[PDB]
């Protein structure tokens, strides 16, 4: 059956961006809202909201500037069959720092920059082009 919802919605938003939709809906969890909050504070995704108690779900809206898409590429690096772990000095820099990196730390989940000032290592989730 299903093995991960993180990969599920990452693939979902990628395919939605390719097909040029305007709304994506999926169930919710604390990890989901945390990752959505981080993405929105950085600014790839427009906004988010939640509805429902017994069956809560999230909704996301993409972003456009002209006909060219915004999310150029995306892929989940950590898989439930193989883990990845990096020290402080080993935080990779995608796209020579132009891009973003999702890191889960002891102090929470945030961008790579604040981790670098705080000098804390943790988990790696996805690479945004």
């Amino acid at each position: 059956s299903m093995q991960d919802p993180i990969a599920d919605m990452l693939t979902r938003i990628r395919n939605g961006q390719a097909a040029n939709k305007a709304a994506v809906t999926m169930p919710s969890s604390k990890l989901k809202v945390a990752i959505a909050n981080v993405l929105k504070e950085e600014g790839f995704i427009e906004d988010f909201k939640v509805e429902g108690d017994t069956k809560p779900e999230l909704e996301l809206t993409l972003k456009y500037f002209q006909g060219k898409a915004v999310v150029e590429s995306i892929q989940r690096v950590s898989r439930p069959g193989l883990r990845i772990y990096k020290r402080k000095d080993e935080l990779p820099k995608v796209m020579a720092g132009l891009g973003i990196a999702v890191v889960s730390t002891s102090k929470g989940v945030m961008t790579d920059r604040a981790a670098r000032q705080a000098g804390l290592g943790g988990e790696i989730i996805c690479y945004v082009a």
Binding site: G43, F44, A96, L98
Partner: protein, 150 residues
């Protein structure tokens, strides 16, 4: 002042009722030393006119490639048919290191120093149009800045 330089040339055949009749083909790129590099492809009966036809066709298919100083900014992938390429900035010095049928198309771009390498099968016709769209997919900080805050 635009530059030019030949790459390769090979014969072909048709084998029509009378017998084997031949023709020639040529390919060439152009560059102004400040990006904005295109290429062309054409065929004729003999080389002296074939190369001229190739160059006269090459004036089309212009593109615009952002460049920084003298080196390329960030790595880029490239895929087409059965060839793949890889690049890396290597700021300052060390010139340009790259294989054949790749040196010319990059030299006219104006970059005086860069590091790159091509993967897989490397027939020259297919290898070109890989660095082209690779540079097409390139982004400088201004464009990404234009869609996210600062």
């Amino acid at each position: 002042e635009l530059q030019e330089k030949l790459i390769a040339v090979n014969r072909v055949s048709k084998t029509v009722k009378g017998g084997r009749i031949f023709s020639f083909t040529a390919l060439t790129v152009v560059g102004d030393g400040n990006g904005r590099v295109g290429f062309g492809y054409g065929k004729a009966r003999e080389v002296p006119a074939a190369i001229q036809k190739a160059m006269e066709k090459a004036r089309r298919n212009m593109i615009n490639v952002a460049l920084n100083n003298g080196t390329l900014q960030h790595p880029v992938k490239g895929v087409h048919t059965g060839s793949r390429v890889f690049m890396q900035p290597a700021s300052e010095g060390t010139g340009i290191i790259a294989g054949g049928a790749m040196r010319a198309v990059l030299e006219v771009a104006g970059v005086h120093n860069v590091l790159a390498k091509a993967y897989g099968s490397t027939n020259p016709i297919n290898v070109v149009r890989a660095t082209i769209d690779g540079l097409e997919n390139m982004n400088s900080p201004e464009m990404v800045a234009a869609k996210r805050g600062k």
